[PDB]
Amino acid sequence: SMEQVAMELRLTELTRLLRSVLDQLQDKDPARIFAQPVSLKEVPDYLDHIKHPMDFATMRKRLEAQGYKNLHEFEEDFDLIIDNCMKYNARDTVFYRAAVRLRDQGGVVLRQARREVDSIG
């Protein structure tokens, strides 16, 4: 149908918008602490602590598979990255501090992407 296609064009644009947003969020992690999944070879008990792991490479696979239907789903995943880190790691660690900074600097990017997604529909 002509409708399914028009739908597919919007998703593709949303995917295009979210890709840009993801690039901006990931520049706020210059140490690449959140780039890849936590290694289960290196942290074998991780899944006993964190039930839904997340990282930027995993978000990107979902992104390019057009797996995010809306900003809300995308934000849920970004928030997992931060929240998982803040539980697993103590307050006086480079890891926890990095999450706080990503959260604070990400807010600005996410605030404008909300307005853009509403705006462009």
PDB file of C-alpha atoms in Angstrom:
ATOM      1  CA  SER A   1       0.000   0.000   0.000  1.00  0.00           C
ATOM      2  CA  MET A   2       0.807   3.653  -0.411  1.00  0.00           C
ATOM      3  CA  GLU A   3       0.126   4.185   3.333  1.00  0.00           C
ATOM      4  CA  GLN A   4       2.695   1.492   4.524  1.00  0.00           C
ATOM      5  CA  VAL A   5       5.355   3.223   2.394  1.00  0.00           C
ATOM      6  CA  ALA A   6       4.572   6.765   3.811  1.00  0.00           C
ATOM      7  CA  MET A   7       4.841   5.113   7.250  1.00  0.00           C
ATOM      8  CA  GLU A   8       8.173   3.530   6.211  1.00  0.00           C
ATOM      9  CA  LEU A   9       9.466   6.972   5.018  1.00  0.00           C
ATOM     10  CA  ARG A  10       8.605   8.582   8.467  1.00  0.00           C
ATOM     11  CA  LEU A  11      10.329   5.727  10.433  1.00  0.00           C
ATOM     12  CA  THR A  12      13.337   6.196   8.153  1.00  0.00           C
ATOM     13  CA  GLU A  13      13.364   9.899   9.019  1.00  0.00           C
ATOM     14  CA  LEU A  14      12.881   9.124  12.759  1.00  0.00           C
ATOM     15  CA  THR A  15      15.770   6.651  12.423  1.00  0.00           C
ATOM     16  CA  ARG A  16      17.714   9.419  10.734  1.00  0.00           C
ATOM     17  CA  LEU A  17      16.868  11.906  13.529  1.00  0.00           C
ATOM     18  CA  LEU A  18      17.644   9.318  16.288  1.00  0.00           C
ATOM     19  CA  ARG A  19      21.004   8.478  14.654  1.00  0.00           C
ATOM     20  CA  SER A  20      22.017  12.100  14.949  1.00  0.00           C
ATOM     21  CA  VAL A  21      20.829  12.220  18.605  1.00  0.00           C
ATOM     22  CA  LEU A  22      22.765   9.027  19.362  1.00  0.00           C
ATOM     23  CA  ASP A  23      25.947  10.539  17.908  1.00  0.00           C
ATOM     24  CA  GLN A  24      25.538  13.630  20.096  1.00  0.00           C
ATOM     25  CA  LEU A  25      24.902  11.525  23.241  1.00  0.00           C
ATOM     26  CA  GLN A  26      27.884   9.308  22.607  1.00  0.00           C
ATOM     27  CA  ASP A  27      30.213  12.421  22.165  1.00  0.00           C
ATOM     28  CA  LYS A  28      29.336  13.162  25.796  1.00  0.00           C
ATOM     29  CA  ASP A  29      31.174   9.869  26.663  1.00  0.00           C
ATOM     30  CA  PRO A  30      34.724  10.652  25.385  1.00  0.00           C
ATOM     31  CA  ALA A  31      36.227   7.944  27.596  1.00  0.00           C
ATOM     32  CA  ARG A  32      34.002   5.324  25.821  1.00  0.00           C
ATOM     33  CA  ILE A  33      32.890   3.886  29.159  1.00  0.00           C
ATOM     34  CA  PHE A  34      29.413   3.165  27.674  1.00  0.00           C
ATOM     35  CA  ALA A  35      30.512   2.243  24.100  1.00  0.00           C
ATOM     36  CA  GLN A  36      30.232  -1.527  24.409  1.00  0.00           C
ATOM     37  CA  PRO A  37      28.404  -4.011  26.590  1.00  0.00           C
ATOM     38  CA  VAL A  38      29.865  -4.830  30.007  1.00  0.00           C
ATOM     39  CA  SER A  39      32.021  -7.938  29.360  1.00  0.00           C
ATOM     40  CA  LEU A  40      30.622 -11.113  30.992  1.00  0.00           C
ATOM     41  CA  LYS A  41      34.079 -12.676  30.584  1.00  0.00           C
ATOM     42  CA  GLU A  42      35.454  -9.782  32.720  1.00  0.00           C
ATOM     43  CA  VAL A  43      32.447  -9.284  35.072  1.00  0.00           C
ATOM     44  CA  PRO A  44      31.022 -12.844  35.280  1.00  0.00           C
ATOM     45  CA  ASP A  45      28.360 -12.002  37.950  1.00  0.00           C
ATOM     46  CA  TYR A  46      27.096  -8.885  36.116  1.00  0.00           C
ATOM     47  CA  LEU A  47      23.655 -10.338  35.259  1.00  0.00           C
ATOM     48  CA  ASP A  48      23.074 -11.160  38.941  1.00  0.00           C
ATOM     49  CA  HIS A  49      23.169  -7.322  39.475  1.00  0.00           C
ATOM     50  CA  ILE A  50      21.825  -5.863  36.260  1.00  0.00           C
ATOM     51  CA  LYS A  51      18.827  -7.509  34.650  1.00  0.00           C
ATOM     52  CA  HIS A  52      18.677  -5.398  31.495  1.00  0.00           C
ATOM     53  CA  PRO A  53      22.134  -4.385  30.278  1.00  0.00           C
ATOM     54  CA  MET A  54      22.514  -1.637  27.801  1.00  0.00           C
ATOM     55  CA  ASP A  55      25.286   0.233  25.940  1.00  0.00           C
ATOM     56  CA  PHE A  56      25.711   2.445  22.865  1.00  0.00           C
ATOM     57  CA  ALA A  57      26.784  -0.320  20.451  1.00  0.00           C
ATOM     58  CA  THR A  58      23.657  -2.346  21.359  1.00  0.00           C
ATOM     59  CA  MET A  59      21.423   0.808  20.875  1.00  0.00           C
ATOM     60  CA  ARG A  60      23.047   1.405  17.488  1.00  0.00           C
ATOM     61  CA  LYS A  61      22.241  -2.200  16.248  1.00  0.00           C
ATOM     62  CA  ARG A  62      18.620  -1.549  17.250  1.00  0.00           C
ATOM     63  CA  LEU A  63      18.715   1.875  15.570  1.00  0.00           C
ATOM     64  CA  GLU A  64      19.979   0.612  12.168  1.00  0.00           C
ATOM     65  CA  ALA A  65      17.437  -2.212  12.284  1.00  0.00           C
ATOM     66  CA  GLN A  66      14.814   0.644  12.602  1.00  0.00           C
ATOM     67  CA  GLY A  67      13.876  -0.952  15.974  1.00  0.00           C
ATOM     68  CA  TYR A  68      12.894   2.272  17.754  1.00  0.00           C
ATOM     69  CA  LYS A  69       9.230   3.234  17.029  1.00  0.00           C
ATOM     70  CA  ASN A  70       9.430   6.523  18.996  1.00  0.00           C
ATOM     71  CA  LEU A  71      11.748   8.767  21.092  1.00  0.00           C
ATOM     72  CA  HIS A  72      10.305   7.235  24.291  1.00  0.00           C
ATOM     73  CA  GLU A  73      11.751   3.773  23.474  1.00  0.00           C
ATOM     74  CA  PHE A  74      15.089   5.323  22.599  1.00  0.00           C
ATOM     75  CA  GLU A  75      15.201   7.272  25.843  1.00  0.00           C
ATOM     76  CA  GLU A  76      14.337   4.178  27.875  1.00  0.00           C
ATOM     77  CA  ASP A  77      17.507   2.533  26.522  1.00  0.00           C
ATOM     78  CA  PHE A  78      19.658   5.619  27.181  1.00  0.00           C
ATOM     79  CA  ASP A  79      18.372   5.776  30.752  1.00  0.00           C
ATOM     80  CA  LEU A  80      19.259   2.048  31.244  1.00  0.00           C
ATOM     81  CA  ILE A  81      22.855   2.813  30.379  1.00  0.00           C
ATOM     82  CA  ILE A  82      22.993   5.480  33.084  1.00  0.00           C
ATOM     83  CA  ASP A  83      20.872   3.796  35.728  1.00  0.00           C
ATOM     84  CA  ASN A  84      22.555   0.411  35.443  1.00  0.00           C
ATOM     85  CA  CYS A  85      25.947   2.121  35.902  1.00  0.00           C
ATOM     86  CA  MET A  86      24.795   4.074  38.958  1.00  0.00           C
ATOM     87  CA  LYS A  87      23.634   0.878  40.672  1.00  0.00           C
ATOM     88  CA  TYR A  88      26.532  -1.418  39.752  1.00  0.00           C
ATOM     89  CA  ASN A  89      29.192   1.123  40.563  1.00  0.00           C
ATOM     90  CA  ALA A  90      29.760   3.007  43.813  1.00  0.00           C
ATOM     91  CA  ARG A  91      29.461   6.789  43.976  1.00  0.00           C
ATOM     92  CA  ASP A  92      33.271   7.290  44.271  1.00  0.00           C
ATOM     93  CA  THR A  93      34.193   5.618  40.969  1.00  0.00           C
ATOM     94  CA  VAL A  94      35.154   6.961  37.605  1.00  0.00           C
ATOM     95  CA  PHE A  95      32.226   4.895  36.200  1.00  0.00           C
ATOM     96  CA  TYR A  96      29.470   6.388  38.361  1.00  0.00           C
ATOM     97  CA  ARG A  97      30.888   9.896  37.806  1.00  0.00           C
ATOM     98  CA  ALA A  98      30.885   9.307  34.057  1.00  0.00           C
ATOM     99  CA  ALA A  99      27.189   8.334  34.123  1.00  0.00           C
ATOM    100  CA  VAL A 100      26.263  11.461  36.097  1.00  0.00           C
ATOM    101  CA  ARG A 101      28.024  13.630  33.500  1.00  0.00           C
ATOM    102  CA  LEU A 102      26.407  11.802  30.543  1.00  0.00           C
ATOM    103  CA  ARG A 103      23.002  12.206  32.173  1.00  0.00           C
ATOM    104  CA  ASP A 104      23.484  15.928  32.807  1.00  0.00           C
ATOM    105  CA  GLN A 105      24.965  16.675  29.366  1.00  0.00           C
ATOM    106  CA  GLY A 106      22.493  14.367  27.593  1.00  0.00           C
ATOM    107  CA  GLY A 107      19.462  16.269  28.989  1.00  0.00           C
ATOM    108  CA  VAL A 108      20.057  19.231  26.661  1.00  0.00           C
ATOM    109  CA  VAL A 109      20.237  16.986  23.555  1.00  0.00           C
ATOM    110  CA  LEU A 110      17.129  14.981  24.590  1.00  0.00           C
ATOM    111  CA  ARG A 111      15.168  18.152  25.438  1.00  0.00           C
ATOM    112  CA  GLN A 112      15.607  19.457  21.865  1.00  0.00           C
ATOM    113  CA  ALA A 113      15.021  16.070  20.184  1.00  0.00           C
ATOM    114  CA  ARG A 114      11.608  15.913  21.961  1.00  0.00           C
ATOM    115  CA  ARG A 115      10.655  19.308  20.509  1.00  0.00           C
ATOM    116  CA  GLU A 116      11.947  18.200  17.003  1.00  0.00           C
ATOM    117  CA  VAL A 117       9.984  14.923  17.006  1.00  0.00           C
ATOM    118  CA  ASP A 118       6.730  16.714  18.034  1.00  0.00           C
ATOM    119  CA  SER A 119       7.471  19.578  15.588  1.00  0.00           C
ATOM    120  CA  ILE A 120       8.197  17.392  12.480  1.00  0.00           C
ATOM    121  CA  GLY A 121       5.526  14.823  13.576  1.00  0.00           C
TER     122      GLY A 121
END
